[PDB]
Design a protein around this ligand. Sequence first.
Ligand SMILES: CC(=O)SCCNC(=O)CCNC(=O)[C@H](O)C(C)(C)COP(=O)(O)OP(=O)(O)OC[C@H]1O[C@@H](n2cnc3c(N)ncnc32)[C@H](O)[C@@H]1OP(=O)(O)O
Length: 174
Amino acid sequence: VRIRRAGLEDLPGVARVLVDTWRATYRGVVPEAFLEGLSYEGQAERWAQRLKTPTWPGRLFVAESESGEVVGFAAFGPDRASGFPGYTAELWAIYVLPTWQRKGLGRALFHEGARLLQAEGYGRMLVWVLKENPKGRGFYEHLGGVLLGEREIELGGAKLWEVAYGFDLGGHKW
Ligand SMILES: CC(=O)SCCNC(=O)CCNC(=O)[C@H](O)C(C)(C)COP(=O)(O)OP(=O)(O)OC[C@H]1O[C@@H](n2cnc3c(N)ncnc32)[C@H](O)[C@@H]1OP(=O)(O)O
């Protein structure tokens, strides 16, 4: 239903959306061991430390169900040294619980963050997504993202490919 900035009380819910969607989306792509390892508590604490840090440049958003549960979230911030001059912002994470997907929540989250990054003066934003994640890829391609590059990372013990999509913030109306 609605999108808003996250508060500290929203984090336990943010952590569940994160872990549950990671588990549902990366089955057979990211090692089972690693996926089983994710922690609701660990995740909630990590975001909590960030939210509590006054100088943290990250921006957090959550998507609410009709009754108010946190069923989606998105984090935006400065790029994390991706090596693409001209791309100063990055979509750190965006996840919507499987059953709440394809109802416009991801788009709404995306637009809210891009709007804020635009107001903060970032010219362009990129996003990294697993080469083997059709869901996220299809979503970004549909939204206009242009393929920028790729890199191999290692999650769990697995070496995996990741691709980047670029989006224009300046000038565009989000
Ligand atoms: C940010 C990094 O972590 S990359 C990882 C991204 N997260 C994941 O892959 C986790 C699994 N997936 C999800 O959480 C969600 O599906 C997301 C975040 C990828 C997308 O959010 P959703 O709410 O499902 O998409 P939403 O309903 O807002 O779709 C918006 C538009 O994109 C289109 N779209 C969304 N996904 C796809 C897709 N996979 N293929 C083609 N089109 C798509 C929708 O049809 C819609 O089109 P429309 O505006 O013309 O009607």
